[PDB]
UniProtKB/Swiss-Prot annotation:
This is Vitamin K-dependent gamma-carboxylase. It comes from Homo sapiens (Human). Mediates the vitamin K-dependent carboxylation of glutamate residues to calcium-binding gamma-carboxyglutamate (Gla) residues with the concomitant conversion of the reduced hydroquinone form of vitamin K to vitamin K epoxide. Catalyzes gamma-carboxylation of various proteins, such as blood coagulation factors (F2, F7, F9 and F10), osteocalcin (BGLAP) or matrix Gla protein (MGP). It comes from the Eukaryota. Optimum pH is 7. The lineage of its organism: Eukaryota, Metazoa, Chordata, Craniata, Vertebrata. The active site is at K187. Its main location: endoplasmic reticulum. PANTHER family: VITAMIN K-DEPENDENT GAMMA-CARBOXYLASE.
């Protein structure tokens, strides 16, 4: 029958529970599962000492210097350095055991435990590939892949050349299809259909022949955005059918190779390439060489429940209102890669003393190791709690901490994200309720960006225009510098007051009015309307302005008569010229020198990781020697091999 030829199954097995159970447990050849197991083990062995932090473990959890952690659960506290090195050693031993296929269950447990522990230990390092690695580890733990091409066959003849059930293939195929389909359906965004996101990626040299047949706007619009969506849909769909197998495999391989070359994601693309050929016939590596029980019901119930859970999970942001933010939820467990970009401008942290009442300012990125806390509420709350418990170390009383964070998403209006008058230390945050101290985004200016495009077709190219939207009640204080000549402010919408404190003069502005700000003084803008206000700064100050004035003077002198202690400006210009010549030389440099330097750096990373692991194991087993020998070993370990 054509139905069973194409779909691989019949309808009459779906009529009964027992018929479905008997259908889902047909035996098959284990060769491709063993090939995928070997490839996944080798890729994880190569991937552990590079991205997970085995080399950089000594400066992430160094003793003495306290860093505000960001765990999912507040009870989690990391172990000291020797125990963390022991945990990474146990994880590497489990990865080696999964790679060689000996003692498969214990190896899968010893790989599944510390990877999930490290993934739950840190929220700032969440990504798509770590979550995919955790899901693939949890999937491959339960399956049996030790029946072909393994040391377990040599150590035991009972587990060599044996059959495997169908659901071990079905779960992995469903997982890959779920990842592809969820990425494709999450790429249907309002900012992605207009091509604003990742619009600067078309300037890369790997798109060099694509500019030969298409214009730059056409290459940036049709190929990057729509072509990626079509490639995701085709990678989801074409691998199921036997007619579209080879062309779909070629497209998947080309897409994964291009994404591996274009970005710095790591070894995610190689793992996707290793999981790509699983959709073929289950005897494809073999040609290269030459009443049901209760567990049958368990292997189907687990498959159905896991598929339902993984289908429901990426659209489960409607229950996580506590972690909800401007866009949606947390990041990483939604498969929406490369959709949004950030450009942070300024962060100001103020503190008021609880006893003296004095006001002071803190450093922007003090006591923190990451830059991902400026977009999420829970990380801000944990940072406030950490600063509240840390600030008495510097002769400070019980503090009041006020934040002021400005951010822009996908080149929009720079507006505040939180209210700067709410103390976060005494504030309330719950995972099951909507937060009350998050400013909503102003999407009403979205067509007026095109009007801003008209402003982008306005005046000199060297001029600068900044779009600022302000909430009612707040005030923006700025210091226009002395060099900022010809600085003007134009009001677009609302009612604002501009105040100069040097002469104590405040004026009200109307729509369309223009004002000239003083240079070298502090100024403030207040919103004095019930509605939020939108306005624009038009100014040009910089070395571009100075060089344009000097270029006009030199051009006038040239057309009149002529041709066209150290010197820091001349040396800076020569350094920029030498930077351009070094870029041109790197383009002209053959690949072998860069490859040798890359291999030397990777060998240094691997050697430093192995030496630090050996030093930590010697300190754990044989105790801690005197500090002179330890300092000598630290100096010897950090030395480049050469
Ligand atoms: C009362 C409750 C009753 C039950 C309620 C729930 C019913 C759920 C039904 C939907 C789930 C069905 C799973 C079927 C899995 C299955 O058949 O396993 C596999 C099929 O592969 C899978 O696991 C399927 C992965 C998802 C594919 C989704 C395709 C959707 C098609 C929709 C219509 C077009 C057996 O085939 P095979 O790959 O081993 O070899 C045959 C294929 N060729 C010939 C191409 C190589
Ligand atoms: C300083 O203010 C702004 C730049 O900050 C400029 O003002 C423009 O004035 C010129 C004519 O002088 C007009 O063509 C432009 O349309 C004005 N800018 C607007 C309305 O966007 C100019 O560089 C300086 N102002 C003056 C009066 O010279
Ligand atoms: C110009 O008018 C504004 C508008 O009232 C004044 O701004 C206020 O400043 C005072 C203290 O300077 C505060 O007590 C008020 O709460 C502010 N108003 C708002 C709505 O926040 C500004 O001080 C005036 N400047 C001069 C020089 O008179
Ligand atoms: C405003 O104009 C000044 C012109 O001096 C710009 O500054 C120079 O700034 C760069 C850093 O961006 C320094 O490396 C140079 O040494 C400065 N030149 C000097 C001091 O002669 C400045 O970037 C412009 N923009 C702002 C926001 O101030
Ligand atoms: C005041 O602060 C300094 C540095 O923070 C330190 O000596 C100590 O915490 C305080 N000293 C006294 C005498 O209270």
């Amino acid at each position: 029958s054509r139905i069973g030829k194409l779909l691989g199954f019949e309808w009459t097995d779906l009529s009964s529970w027992r018929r479905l159970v008997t259908l889902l447990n047909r035996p098959t050849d284990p060769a491709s599962l063993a090939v995928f197991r070997f490839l996944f083990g080798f890729l994880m062995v190569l991937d552990i000492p590079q991205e997970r932090g085995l080399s950089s473990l000594d400066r992430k959890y160094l003793d003495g210097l306290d860093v505000c952690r960001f765990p999912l659960l507040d009870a989690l506290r990391p172990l000291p350095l020797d125990w963390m090195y022991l945990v990474y050693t146990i994880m590497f031993l489990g990865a080696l055991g999964m790679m060689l296929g000996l003692c498969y269950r214990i190896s899968c447990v010893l790989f599944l435990l510390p990877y999930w522990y490290v993934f739950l230990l840190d929220k700032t390092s969440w990504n798509n590939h770590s979550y995919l690695y955790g899901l693939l580890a949890f999937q491959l733990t339960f399956m049996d892949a030790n029946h072909y091409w393994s040391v377990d066959g040599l150590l035991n003849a009972h587990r060599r050349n044996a059959h495997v059930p169908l659901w071990n293939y079905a779960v992995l195929r469903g997982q890959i299809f779920i990842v592809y389909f969820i990425a494709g359906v999450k790429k249907l965004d309002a900012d992605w259909v207009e091509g604003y996101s990742m619009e600067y990626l078309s300037r890369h040299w790997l798109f060099s022949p694509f500019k030969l047949l298409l214009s730059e706007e056409l290459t940036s619009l049709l190929v990057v955005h729509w072509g990626g969506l079509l490639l995701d849909l085709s990678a989801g769909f074409l691998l199921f059918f036997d007619v579209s197998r080879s062309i779909g495999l070629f497209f998947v391989s080309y897409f994964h190779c291009m994404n591996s070359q274009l970005f710095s994601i790591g070894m995610f693309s190689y793992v996707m390439l290793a999981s790509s050929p699983l959709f073929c016939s289950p005897e494809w590596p073999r040609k290269l060489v030459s009443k049901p029980g209760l567990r049958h019901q368990l292997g189907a119930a687990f498959t159905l429940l896991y598929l339902l859970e993984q289908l429901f999970l990426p659209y489960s942001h409607f229950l996580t209102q506590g972690y909800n933010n401007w866009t949606n939820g947390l990041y990483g467990y939604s498969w929406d890669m490369m959709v949004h970009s950030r450009s942070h401008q300024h962060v100001k942290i103020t503190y008021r003393d609880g006893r003296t009442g004095e006001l002071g300012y803190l450093n922007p990125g003090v006591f923190t190791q990451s830059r991902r806390w400026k977009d999420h509420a829970d990380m801000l709350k944990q940072y406030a709690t950490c600063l509240s418990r840390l600030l008495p170390k510097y002769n400070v009383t019980e503090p009041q901490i006020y934040f002021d964070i400005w951010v822009s998403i996908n080149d929009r209006f720079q507006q505040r994200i939180f209210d700067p008058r709410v103390d976060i230390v005494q504030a309330a945050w719950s995972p099951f309720q909507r937060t009350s101290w998050v400013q909503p985004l102003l999407m009403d200016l979205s067509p007026w960006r095109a009007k801003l495009q008209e402003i982008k077709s306005s005046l000199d190219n060297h001029t600068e225009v900044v779009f600022i939207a302000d909430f009612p009640g707040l005030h923006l204080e700025n210091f226009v510098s002395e060099d900022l000549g010809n600085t003007s402010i134009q009001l677009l919408q609302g009612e604002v007051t501009v105040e100069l404190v040097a002469e104590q003069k405040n004026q009200t502005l109307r729509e369309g009015e223009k004002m000239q700000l003083p240079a070298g003084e502090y100024h403030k803008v207040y919103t004095t309307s019930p509605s939020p206000s939108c306005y624009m700064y038009v100014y040009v100050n910089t070395t571009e302005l100075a060089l344009e004035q000097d270029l006009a003077y030199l051009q006038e002198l040239k057309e009149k008569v002529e041709n066209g202690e150290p010197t820091p400006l001349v040396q800076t210009f020569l350094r920029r010229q030498q930077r351009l010549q070094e870029i041109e030389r790197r383009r002209n440099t053959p690949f072998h020198e860069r490859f040798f330097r890359f291999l030397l750096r990777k060998l240094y990373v691997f050697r430093r990781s192995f030496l630090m692991t050996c030093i930590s194991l010697r300190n754990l087993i044989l105790g801690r020697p005197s500090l002179e020998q330890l300092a000598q070993e630290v100096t010897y370990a950090n030395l480049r091999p050469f």
